[PDB]
Amino acid sequence: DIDTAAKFIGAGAATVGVAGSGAGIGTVFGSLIIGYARNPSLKQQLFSYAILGFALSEAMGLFCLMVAFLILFAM
Amino acid sequence: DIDTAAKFIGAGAATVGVAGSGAGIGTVFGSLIIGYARNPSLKQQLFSYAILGFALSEAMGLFCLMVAFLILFAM
Amino acid sequence: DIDTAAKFIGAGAATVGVAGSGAGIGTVFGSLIIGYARNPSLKQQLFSYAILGFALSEAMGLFCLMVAFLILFAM
Amino acid sequence: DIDTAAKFIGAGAATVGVAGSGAGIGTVFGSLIIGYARNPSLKQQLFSYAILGFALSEAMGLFCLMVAFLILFAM
Amino acid sequence: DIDTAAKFIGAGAATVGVAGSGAGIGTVFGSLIIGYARNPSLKQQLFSYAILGFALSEAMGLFCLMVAFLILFAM
Amino acid sequence: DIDTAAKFIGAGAATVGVAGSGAGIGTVFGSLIIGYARNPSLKQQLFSYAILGFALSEAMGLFCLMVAFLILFAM
Amino acid sequence: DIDTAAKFIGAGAATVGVAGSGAGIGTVFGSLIIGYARNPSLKQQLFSYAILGFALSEAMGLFCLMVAFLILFAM
Amino acid sequence: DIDTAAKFIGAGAATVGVAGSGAGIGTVFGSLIIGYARNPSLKQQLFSYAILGFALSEAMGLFCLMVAFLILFAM
Amino acid sequence: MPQLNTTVWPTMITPMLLTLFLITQLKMLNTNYHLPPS
Amino acid sequence: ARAERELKPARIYGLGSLALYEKADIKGPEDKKKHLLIGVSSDRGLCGAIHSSIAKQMKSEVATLTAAGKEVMLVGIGDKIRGILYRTHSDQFLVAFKEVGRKPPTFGDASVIALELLNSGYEFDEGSIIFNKFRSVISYKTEEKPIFSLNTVASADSMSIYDDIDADVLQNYQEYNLANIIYYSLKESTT
Amino acid sequence: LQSIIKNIWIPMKPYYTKVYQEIWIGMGLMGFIVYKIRAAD
Amino acid sequence: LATFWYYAKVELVPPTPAEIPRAIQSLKKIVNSAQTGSFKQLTVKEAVLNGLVATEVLMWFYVGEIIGKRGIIGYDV
Amino acid sequence: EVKLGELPSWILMRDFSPSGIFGAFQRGYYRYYNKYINVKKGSISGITMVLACYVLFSYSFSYKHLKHERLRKY
Amino acid sequence: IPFDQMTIEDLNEAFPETKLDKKKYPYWPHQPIENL
Amino acid sequence: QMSFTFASPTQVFFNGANVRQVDVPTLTGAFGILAAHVPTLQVLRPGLVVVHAEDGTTSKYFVSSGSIAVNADSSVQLLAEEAVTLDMLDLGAAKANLEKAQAELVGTADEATRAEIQIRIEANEALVKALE
Amino acid sequence: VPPVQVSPLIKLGRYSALFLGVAYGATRYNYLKPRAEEERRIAA
Amino acid sequence: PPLPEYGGKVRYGLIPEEFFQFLYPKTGVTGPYVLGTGLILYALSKEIYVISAETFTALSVLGVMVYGIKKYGPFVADFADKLNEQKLAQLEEAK
Amino acid sequence: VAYWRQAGLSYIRYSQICAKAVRDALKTEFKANAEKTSGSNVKIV
Amino acid sequence: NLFASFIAPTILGLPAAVLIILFPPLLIPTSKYLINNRLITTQQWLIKLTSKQMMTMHNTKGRTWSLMLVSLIIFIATTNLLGLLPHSFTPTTQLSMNLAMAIPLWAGTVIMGFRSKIKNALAHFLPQGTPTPLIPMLVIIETISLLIQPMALAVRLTANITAGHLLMHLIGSATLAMSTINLPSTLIIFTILILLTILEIAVALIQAYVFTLLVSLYLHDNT
Ligand SMILES: COc1nc2ccc(Br)cc2cc1[C@@H](c1ccccc1)[C@@](O)(CCN(C)C)c1cccc2ccccc12
C-alpha cells in the first residue's frame, strides 16, 4: 500500500503548482488597476485584456489541479 | 499505516500553494496604492478592481487549502 | 511511528508557505514607497491601503502556519 | 512497488514547474495592459509581443512536462 | 531513529520559507531606490517606510526560521 | 530498489526549478512590451536586449534540467 | 543509518531559501537601472542603496545556507 | 544503501534553488529594457549595471548548484 | 548521458580546434571590406 | 484702448508660461554656435520709435553675437522691422510675416508663426525674442526674452527634479512654450 | 609543405604569435583539465 | 491531375501482345551482348542508364510485392 | 574523364595518392561551386542539394541505431 | 576594366583611396569597426 | 499650499488660487495633482479638467491642448490653448465630426494626413466621452 | 513535351516483375503468418 | 572572368534537370518519377527508412524550410541583387 | 513618442488640430465669437 | 535508446564526427572579386553586420579579437543550424567541445587581464561605490563566480541545445504514438512541433549570439 501513499504525496506536490497562477492573476489585476488609473478612458478594452490574461495564467494553474487529480484518482 | 503519513505530507505540500495567493494579494494592493496615488479621483473604481483581483487570488489560494483539507480528512 | 515523522515533514512543508506573505508584504510596502514619493499629500490614505494590503497578504501566510499547527499538534 | 511510488512523487514534483509559466503569462499580459494603456495606437504590435511571450512561457513549461513524462513512463 | 531524521527534514523544509523575506526585502529596497530617484526631496521619510517594509517582510521570514527551530530543537 | 526510487524523486525535485526561468521570461517580454510602448522608435535595440534577457533567464532553468538528467540517467 | 540520509535531505531542502536572495538581488539591481535612467545625477547615492539592498537580501539567503550546514556537519 | 538515495533526493532539493536566479535575471534585463526605453542616451551605463546585476543574481543560483554537487559527489 | 563518456572526447576537441582557429578564421581573413572611393 | 484690456489675461497666460524657466532657473548655454533672433513689431508706421528701437536692439545684439562667433539668423514678425533690417541683414534672415497689426493679434497667429519657425529646418540652439514691453500709456521699454532649445532644458541639472520627463515631453513642452512666448510678445507689442 | 607555410601560416602569423598567446595558455589549461577528467574515469 | 494520366497512357500501360516480338528481340540483343561479350563495347553513360532502368524494373517488382501482401511496411505479421 | 571511358585499367590508372584524391575532391567541389553557386542570379538549390546530401550522410551512420526501432521483424 | 571583372587588388591599383591601411591597422578587419 | 493658475490665451479662470486638487489629461495619461505633488511638466491632450476647490465643490472645464507644470514650491500652472466650460459644447456636432473624420480616415491612405485625421478623431472621441 | 514510347523489353520487365512480386509477396505472407503466430503464442 | 547568369536548373531543390534529361530518352517523361516513387516504396517497405520520431521532426523542419524559402526567397534574392547593383552604381559614379 | 511624432508632426500642429476640433464642437451661440477671437491672420513671405 | 542522437557517430568503424565538425566552413565560400554572387554577397553583409554589432563596444586592444569573436559566432551559429537537419549529430550538444570552446577563451581573457591591468582587474572585484563594512563577503562571490564563468558558459550552450533536441524528439514520438489514434489530436501536436521547430531555429541563432556576447563581455572587462 505504498502506491496509494505516494499517490497522495504526488497529488500534494502537483497541486503546489497553483502558486504561479495565484501570482499571475495578482499581477494581471494589479496592472489593470495601474493602467486604468493612467488612461481611464479605455476602461472597457483594458478590462477585456485583463480577462484574457486572467484566463490564461489561471488556465496553467488549473492544469496543475487536473494533474493533481490525475495522480490522486485516475492513476 | 503509511497512508496517514502520506496524508500529512500531502496536506503540507498542498498548503504550500498559498504563497501564490499571498504574493498576488500583495501585488494587487500595491498596484492599488500606486494607481490611487497617481489618479486619486478614481478611488471607488480602483478599489472595486482591487477587490476583484484580491477575490480571484485568494480564490486560487483557497483552492490550494481546500485540496489540502480534502487530502487530510476526506481521503 | 512513521506517522509522527510525517507530521514533522508536513509541518515544515506547510510552513514553507509563508514565503508568499513575505513577498506580498514586500511588494505592498515597495508600492507604498513609490506612491508616496509621487503624491505625498495622500500619506494618510495610501498608508491605510498599505495596512489593508499587509493585513490581507499576511493573513494568507498565517493560514499556512495554521495548517502547520494543525498537523504538528492537532494530530 | 516503491519504484512506481517514487515515480508518482517525482511526476508531481516535476509538474510543479509550470507555476513559473503561470506567473510569466500573468506578467506578460499585465504589462500588455499597461503598455496598451500607455500607447493605445500600437495595439497590434503589443498583442503580437504578448503572444510571443505567452508562447515562450508555455514552452519553458513543456520543458517540465517533458521530465514529468520521462519519470512517469519512459524511465 | 526515524523521528530525528524527519525532524531534520522538516526543519529544512521549514527554513525554505525565508525566500519570501528575501524577495520582499529586494522589492522594498528596489522601490526605495526608484522612489528616491523620482522625488529625492522626501528621502528621509521614504527611507522610513523602507525600514518598516524590511522590518515587516523579514519578520515573516523569522517565523519560518523559528518554527524550524521548534521542530529541530524543541520537539 | 530505493536508489532508483530516490533518483526519480530527486529528478522531479530538480526539475521543479524551471519556474524561475518561466517567470523571468514573462518579466522580460512584459518589459519589452512596456519599453516598446514608450519608445517605439527603438523597436530593434529593445528587442535585442529582450533576446539577451531571455537567453540568460531560460539558461538558469536548463541548469536544473541538467541536474535532473544528471540524476535520472548518469547517476 | 537513517540520520545521515535525512541530514542530506534536510540540507538539500534548506538550501532552497537562496531563491529569495536571487530574486531580491535581481529586483534591487533592476530597480537601480530604472532609478538611474530616471535621475542619473544621483548615481552615487542610488548605488549605495543598491548595495544596501543587495547586502541585505543576500544576507537572508546566507542564513538559509548556514542552516543547511548547521544540520549537515554541526548537528 | 539509503544514504546514496538521500544524496540524490537532497541534490534535487538543493538544485531547485535556481528559480530565484532565473527570476532575478529576468527582472534585471526587463528593467534594463524599460530604463533604456526611457533614457536611451545612457545605453552603455545602464548595460553595465545590468551585467553587474546579472553577474550577482546568477551568482546566488550557482551557490545552490555547488551545494548540489557538494551533496552529490563529495558527501 | 552519452556526453559523459570521456573516451570520445579528443575526437571532439581536435577537429574543433582545426575549425574554430584555423579554417573559419582563414575564411574570415579572405572576407575584406575595402574603403569607399571618392 | 481695447488692446490694454486684452493684455491682462494674455499677460497672466504668457507670464505663467515662463514661470517654469525662472523657478527651474534655466541659464541657457553661452557656448553653442547657432542662434535665432525674433523681432516683433507691426506693419503700419506712424508709431514713433517702436520699429526703430526693435531694429536697434536686433542689429546691436546681432553684432554682439557675431563678435563672439555665434551664427545668428533673423526672423521678423511685422513688415516694418523686416523692411528696416532687410537692407543690411538679408543673408542672416530666416523668414518674415505679414498682416501683423491690422487685426488684433490672436493665438492662431502665434501658432502659425511657431509652426513655420519649426518647419524651417533651422536647428536653432538658442533664441531670443525682442518686443516692446508696455508699461504705461506714455512709456514702453524694448525688452527681450530668451528661448531655450531641447538640449539646454534637458541637460540642465536643475530639471532633474521634474518627474515623468523624457525627450519627447520636453520637445512638446518646448514647442508649446515657443508658441506661448510668441503670443505674449505679440500681445505686448500691440500695446 | 609549401603553401602550407604561405596560405596557412602566413595569414595566421600575427594572430597565432601575438594576439592568441594567452589563448594558448588557456588551451594548455584546458588540455590539463581534460586529461585530469579522463584520468578519473 | 490529368497530365499524369495523359502521359501514362503511352508508356505506363501493360504491353500489348503485338509488341512482345520486339520485346524478346531486345532480350535477344542483350543476350547477344552476353554471347560475345559486347558489354566490353559499352561506355559508362548508357551503362549506368541501363543500370537505372534495371533498378526501376526491380522497383516494379517490389511494388508488386507490397501489393501482393496488402501491406506497405513489411509483412504485417 | 569517366562517362566516356570503357576500360577497367582507368580505375587504377588514376592518381591514388593522398594529394591525388585531395585534388580530386577539390576539383569536384570547384565544379559544383562553379555550376550552382558561383553564378549571378543564383538560386537556393545550390545549398539545398548540399543539405540533402548532408542529411543522407547523417542518416547513413544513424541507421545502426534506427534499426533497433523497427516495427516489423519479418 | 569593367567592375564586374575587377579584383580588389585591381581596385586598389585604380583607386588608391580604397587600399586598406595594413600598417595602422594590422588585424582584421584592418579598419575601424565604425567605418566598416 | 497649492497655487493654481489656470489660463487660456484670452481668459483666466484661476490665478494664484488655492484649490486642493486638479485632474489633468496629460499625453502620458491622466493624473490628479494635490499639494506637494512631485514636480513635473507635461503637455495636455483633449479632455476634462476637474478643479476641486477647498469647499469640496468641483469645476469642470474641457481643455484642448497646452501644458501643465507642477513646480517644486507647489505652484501649478495650467495653460490650455482652448479651455471651454462644458456648458458651451454640444454632442451632435462632435459625433457628426467624428463620423466625418473616421470617413476620411478610411478614405485616406497617406501617413501624415491620416495622422492629422487620427488626431481629430481622438479629439472628438474625448469630446464625446466628456459630454456623454 | 510529348511522351516517349518505351522500349517493349522495359515494359515487359516492368509488368513481369510486378506479377512475380505479387506472387512472391502473397506466398511469403501466407508462409510467415503461421510461424509468426506460432512464435507469438510460444513467447508467452 | 565574368560569372554565368544562371545555375543548373534544379527541380524541387533536390534533383537537377540533367538527371531528367539523361533519363528522358529510354523511359520517357515519367521515368525519373516512377524510379523515385519505387525507391521511396522500397525504402520504407524493407525498413530501409524506418519511421520514428525523427520522421516527424524531419517533416516539420522540411515544412519550415519550404515555407521560409517560398516566403523569403524573392526578398533575399532582390536584396542581394540590390546590394550588388548599389555597389556597382557607387563604383561607376566614383569613376 | 506618439504616432503623429512618428508621422513628422509637431505639438503645435497637434494643438491646432485639437483646438479646431473643440471649436467645431461649440454650439452656434459661441462658435462665431470663438473662431473670431482665435482665428489667424498672419501670413508668410 | 533516447539519447541515441547524442552518441559519437561512427560509420564503418570511422569517427565521422570529425567530418561533421569540419563541414561548417565549407558553407562559407570566399572570393577575391569585387562583385560576386548572391551567396557571398549576403554572407559578407551578414559578417559586416555581425562584426559591427559585437566589436563596436571595444577599445583598440579589444578590437584585435575581431577575427576570433566573429569566427566564433559564425562557427557556433552554423553548427547549431546544421544540427536541426533530420538525424543530424550536433557537436555543440557535447560537453567536451563546448568546454574546449569555453575554457581557452575565458582563460586567455582573465590571463590578459592579469598580465596587464592587473591592478584594475583586481579592483574590478570590488565595485566602485561599495561601502566598506562588508567588502570581504563580496570578495567570496565575485572570485567564485569568476571561477565558474567558463563552465557556466559551456553548459549554458550544451544544456540548451541538447534539451531543445530532446524536446523535439519527444514531441515527435507523441505524434507517432497518436498517428494511429484521433488525427485532429495528431495535427494539434504537429502544430506544436512546428512552433517548437521555429523556436529551435531562433534558439540556435540566439545561443550562438549569447555565447559570443558573453565572451565579448568577459574580454571587455579585461581590456
Ligand atoms: C495548448 O497549450 C499549449 N500551448 C503552446 C503554445 C506554444 C508552444 Br511552443 C507550446 C504549447 C504547448 C501547449 C500544450 C501542448 C498541447 C499539445 C501538445 C504539446 C503541448 C501544453 O504544453 C500546455 C503548455 N503547458 C501546460 C506546458 C500541454 C503539454 C502537455 C500536456 C497538455 C495537456 C493538456 C493541455 C496542454 C498540454
For residue B12, the surrounding DSSP H or E stretch is: helix B2-15
For residue J178, the surrounding DSSP H or E stretch is: helix J167-189
Residues of Q with Cβ-Cβ distance to S194 under 8 angstroms: 60, 63-64
Query: For residue J117, which of J37, J186, J32 has the smallest C-alpha distance?
Result: J37
Question: Residue D11 burial by CB count (10 A; 0-12/13-18/19+): exposed, middle or buried?
Answer: buried
- Ligand 1, atom 34, residue with closest C-alpha: A63
Verify whether the Cβ–Cβ distance G29 to H28 is below 8 Å. yes
**CA of E29 to nearest chain O CA: how many angstroms apart?**
20
CA of S192 to the centre of ligand 1 (A): 7
Tell me if K22 sits within 8 A of S112, measured CB to CB: yes
**CA of B75 to nearest chain C CA: how many angstroms apart?**
15
O83-85 β-sheet, strand order: O29-33, O21-26, O47-52, O58-63, O83-85
Q: Which residues of M touch Q (CB under 8 A)?
A: 35-46, 48-49, 52, 66-67, 69-72
Any chain A CB within 8 A of the CB of F34?
A: no
Verify whether the Cβ–Cβ distance O29 to D38 is below 8 Å. yes
Verify whether the Cβ–Cβ distance P22 to L11 is below 8 Å. no
Any chain F CB within 8 A of the CB of H2?
A: yes
Alpha carbons within 13 A on the beta-carbon side of J141: 4
Angle subtended by helix axes D2-15 and F2-15, to nearest 10: 10
Q: Which three cell numbers stand for residue S88?
A: 543530424
Any chain Q CB within 8 A of the CB of L30?
A: no
Residue of chain S with shortest Cα separation from Q5: S37
What CATH code is assigned to G2-73?
1.20.20.10
Verify whether the Cβ–Cβ distance I13 to S96 is below 8 Å. yes
Residues forming a β-bridge with O17: O4
Task: Give SS3 for O59.
Answer: strand
Task: Give the start-to-end residue ranges of the domains of chain M.
Answer: 9-69
Residues forming a β-bridge with O5: O77
Domain of L71 in residue numbering reads as 41-77
Q: Which atom of ligand 1 is nearest to the CA of S188?
A: 17
DSSP state of P7: P
Any chain B CB within 8 A of the CB of E35?
A: no
Task: Give SS3 for O22.
Answer: strand
Domain of S93 in residue numbering reads as 1-223
Any chain Q CB within 8 A of the CB of S172?
A: yes
Question: Is the backbone peptide bond immediately before N29 cis, with ω within 30 degrees of 0?
Answer: yes
Q: Is S192 in the pocket of ligand 1 (CB under 6 A)?
A: yes
Residue of chain K with shortest Cα separation from N22: K14
Q: Is D58 in the pocket of ligand 1 (CB under 6 A)?
A: yes
Any chain N CB within 8 A of the CB of K14?
A: yes
As a whole number of angstroms, the distance between CA J13 and CA O6 comes to: 8
Any chain O CB within 8 A of the CB of A2?
A: no
Q: Is D34 in the pocket of ligand 1 (CB under 6 A)?
A: no
Q: Which three cell numbers stand for residue E44?
A: 528621509
Q: Write the single-letter amino acid at L18.
A: A
Query: For residue H34, which of C26, O49, J166 has the smallest C-alpha distance?
Result: J166
Task: Give the start-to-end residue ranges of the domains of chain C.
Answer: 2-73
DSSP state of F45: H
Residues of Q with Cβ-Cβ distance to P4 under 8 angstroms: 24-25, 27-29
Tell me if H27 sits within 8 A of E30, measured CB to CB: no
**CA of G65 to nearest chain S CA: how many angstroms apart?**
14
DSSP string across S22-70: HSGGGG-----BSS--HHHHHHHHHHHHHHHHHHTTS-TTGGGGHHHHH
Task: Give the start-to-end residue ranges of the domains of chain K.
Answer: 11-39
Question: Quick one: resolution in A?
Answer: 3.1
Q: Which positions ≥6 away from P36 have C-beta within 8 Å?
A: L75, L77
Experimental method used, please? cryo-EM
Q: Is D59 in the pocket of ligand 1 (CB under 6 A)?
A: yes
Q: Which positions ≥6 away from Q34 have C-beta within 8 Å?
A: L12, L56, L59, Q27
Tell me if E65 sits within 8 A of C16, measured CB to CB: no
Question: Residue C38 burial by CB count (10 A; 0-12/13-18/19+): exposed, middle or buried?
Answer: buried
Q: Is D62 in the pocket of ligand 1 (CB under 6 A)?
A: yes
* Helical segments of chain E, H only: 2-15, 18-38, 43-69
Number of neighbouring beta carbons within 10 Å of residue H75? 10
3-state helix, strand, coil in chain J (%, to 5): 50, 20, 35
Tell me if S104 sits within 8 A of K30, measured CB to CB: yes
End-to-end CA distance of chain K: 39
According to DSSP, the β-strands at O75-80 and Q15-16 are unpaired
Any chain A CB within 8 A of the CB of C35?
A: no
Tell me if S61 sits within 8 A of S223, measured CB to CB: yes
Task: Give SS3 for P6.
Answer: coil
Q: Is A20 in the pocket of ligand 1 (CB under 6 A)?
A: no
**CA of I19 to nearest chain F CA: how many angstroms apart?**
26
Q: Is D65 in the pocket of ligand 1 (CB under 6 A)?
A: yes
Tell me if S87 sits within 8 A of S5, measured CB to CB: yes
According to DSSP, the β-strands at J35-40 and J126-134 are parallel
Query: For residue J149, which of J185, J122, J131 has the smallest C-alpha distance?
Result: J122
Q: Is S188 in the pocket of ligand 1 (CB under 6 A)?
A: yes
The greatest distance separating any two alpha carbons of chain J, rounded to the nearest whole angstrom, comes to: 50
Verify whether the Cβ–Cβ distance C38 to O34 is below 8 Å. no
Of the residues D52, D54, D62, D73, which should be mutated to test ligand 1's pocket, given the most ligand atoms within 8 Å of the CB? Answer: D62
Any chain R CB within 8 A of the CB of O127?
A: yes
Q: Is S196 in the pocket of ligand 1 (CB under 6 A)?
A: yes
Any chain N CB within 8 A of the CB of Q1?
A: yes
Alpha carbons within 13 A on the beta-carbon side of B49: 34
End-to-end CA distance of chain L: 36
Q: Which residue has the cell 476641486?
A: O52
* Helical segments of C1-75, H only: 2-15, 18-38, 43-72
Q: Write the single-letter amino acid at S202.
A: A
Of the residues S171, S189, S192, S200, which should be mutated to test ligand 1's pocket, given the most ligand atoms within 8 Å of the CB? Answer: S192
Q: How many inter-chain contacts (D to H, CB under 8 Å) are there?
A: 4
CA of D62 to the centre of ligand 1 (A): 7
C-alpha radius of gyration, chain I, whole number = 18
Tell me if G68 sits within 8 A of G15, measured CB to CB: yes
For J138, left (φ over 0), alpha (ψ -120 to 50), or beta?
Answer: alpha
Residue of chain A with shortest Cα separation from B59: A22
